[PDB]
């Protein structure tokens, strides 16, 4: 009753594919690193553990070859990576804005507000100005723009959403997430072995929803979000710290993700439950529930699986957008929320969340920060 | 009437170090080695001495500068010191203005149950938001939302978030901030860049914060409600501001008349905040019967909206006083104006909290050319 819905979702990919089995063999060959064997054989492992079959990405042998200091380990790069990332993020974005807006079905002037995720480049005006720009959206949309955000930005722009629309009478809310690894990429080192991660993972991607309260009757409701919270978890000081400098943006991993997230599942999802208890006077067990989940690699996945003793079916939303794309950072929940509704209708589910009521949508980031909504099917 | 955003307390802090705009042009084309420099220097005197500003405040000085001497060129690879300083000394001075925020609100930190924090000095990750979180100690789940790169209309960003934040969210205690310091953008001057002076000549650090909050209680002392807040590119202004991010630093370019803009529209952008009025009132104010809480952006736009909009003098006088002590200190620059307009009600025996009047507009405004527009009650 007046809770944000959830209207439409899009999605966009940069065009070119790279498999993931001989992703290994294009890197170290455009970083010129071949006579790193074991470094390329610790990767290729990494990559084969992925739970990834391809990715998409805007650059390509060309685009590197014409810009060397990105295929360098530290060289000086940030001005490139720059003018890749303010261009290409916002025309992503639009093209995952246009499906979205397709789906809702109403008219683009009905947009009332623009909530812009990216950890990809930053720049004034912001890509939420190019966006409003690129899509002639009325000049006087209220926009919000998150920069620098990281992974759990997919679940943060809902969270953000969630308040406009329900305090505004009438608003329909654009959310994009649009990231390009432009920024990220780098030669592999030996020093650096934490970076072969995001190198095995990082994948390009924009995702839209169209969010709003009091859907009419032309519009058709996907999920709609009942409860929000963030919170910075216990022991994970410097767990995911990103740095922005004159060599790109550069991530150092100093903590075990997995297993933090998934000492602490149980605990975060207490509040929610709770809400649950008070509407339904029930308490159901976590596979009960469906699950949109961040895929920030496989063994989170494995890990809260495990920990909350799911069926292996509820995680499957969530491996497939791994599968298919990888990890596009903040886009990729979103992703993942347009694979659950996706598979509803090929495998004939009873609703938009896995044939169950109630889901949990999860994002995480440096903090070590959690993002955790809860879910309505509809 | 019942229910708005309410601006519960106000807190600020500069770096201590002040520098005489007088003597701002020897100094600066000292450290950056630009003596030679004689016509370029004379113009930017001209500039400063115009500018309304009698000092500004900066972390930057003589010392750090020649540590760092990246910065002391025109276009010189320093991001990474920079940022350095930055990414360290924008939470530790929101960290101070939040302090004195929070004993003003008088209740105890763990009730803060939202944080907003706005810059455009630096980028990191965890953000400048977790790290004021751990600065203040406050509770894990606070619930978070990072505004980086903004530009000179987050002050007004910060707030209009904040009410949405407040008003959907049943005993919601929201901490915004705003905190900025120059490192990233200061350089040295050039005649190929003369956009840039206006920079160099204006800006200066500062942070702020507010604790906001609806349906505040007893032991709560409002100061201003927040009754309409929005957000629009105005026509023919592409390219007005733009600010470009690069090894170099932080780069601004100029490229219209803003102020020019500005007033040419502002007249059409108030229109809806005054029919609110009219709904709530029944009555249509003139502007000047309005209190003014503006962006300092610099003095040809107070000029020209005074002007424009035929305000009293007095009207503009909190933002010019800010201005003149402060400089434009970007996005927490109308923050500091807010409380400069409470604090004159104390002091000028007024009536309310926004000059003795009912109704006042809050603006900023950055890169677009945005205009964020809030229509503010007084207490």
Redesign the interface.
């Known amino acids: 009753s007046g809770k944000a819905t959830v209207l439409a979702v899009g999605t966009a990919v940069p065009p070119k594919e790279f498999d993931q089995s001989t992703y290994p063999d294009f890197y170290f060959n455009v970083t010129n690193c071949n006579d790193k064997v074991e470094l390329k054989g610790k990767f290729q492992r990494i990559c084969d553990r992925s739970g990834i079959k391809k990715r998409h990405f805007y650059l390509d042998e060309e685009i590197l070859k014409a810009n060397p200091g990105m295929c360098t380990y530290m060289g000086?790069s940030?001005?490139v990576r720059?003018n890749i990332a303010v261009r290409e993020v916002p025309k992503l974005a639009k093209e995952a804005a246009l499906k979205a807006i397709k789906e809702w079905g109403q008219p683009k002037s009905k947009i009332t507000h623009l909530v812009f995720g990216t950890?990809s480049g930053?720049?004034?005006?912001?890509a939420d100005?190019q966006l409003?720009k690129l899509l002639g959206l009325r000049?006087?949309?209220?926009?919000?723009?998150?920069?620098?955000?990281?992974c759990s930005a997919g679940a943060?722009v809902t969270?953000?959403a969630?308040?406009?629309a329900?305090?505004?009478p009438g608003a329909r809310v654009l959310v994009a997430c649009s990231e390009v690894t432009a920024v990220t990429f780098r030669a592999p080192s030996e020093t650096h072995l934490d970076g072969l991660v995001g190198a095995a993972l990082f994948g390009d991607g924009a995702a839209a929803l169209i969010i709003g309260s009091n859907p009419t009757p032309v519009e058709k409701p996907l999920f709609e979000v009942h409860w929000?919270?963030?919170?910075?978890?216990?022991d994970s000081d410097g767990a995911?710290?990103?740095?922005?400098?004159?060599a790109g943006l550069v991530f150092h991993l100093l903590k075990d993700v997995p297993g933090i997230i998934s000492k602490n599942i149980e605990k975060l999802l207490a509040e929610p439950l709770d809400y649950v208890k008070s509407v339904d006077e029930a308490s159901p067990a976590y596979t009960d529930l469906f699950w949109v989940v961040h895929p920030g690699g496989p063994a989170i996945l494995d890990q809260v699986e495990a920990k909350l003793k799911l069926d292996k079916d509820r995680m499957q939303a969530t491996r497939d957008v791994l599968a298919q794309y990888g990890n596009m950072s903040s886009a990729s929940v979103l992703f993942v929320l347009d694979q659950m509704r996706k598979r509803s209708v090929e495998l004939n589910k009873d609703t938009t969340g896995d044939g169950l009521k109630w889901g949990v949508m999860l994002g995480f980031?440096?903090?070590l920060?959690v993002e955790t909504l809860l879910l309505k099917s509809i």
Do not use: W
């Open positions: 000086a940030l001005d720059q950890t930053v720049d004034m005006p912001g100005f409003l000049p006087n949309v209220k926009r919000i723009m998150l920069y620098q955000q990281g943060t969270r953000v969630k308040d406009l329900e305090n505004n929000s919270g963030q919170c910075v978890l216990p995911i710290l990103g740095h922005l400098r004159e980031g440096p903090g920060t």
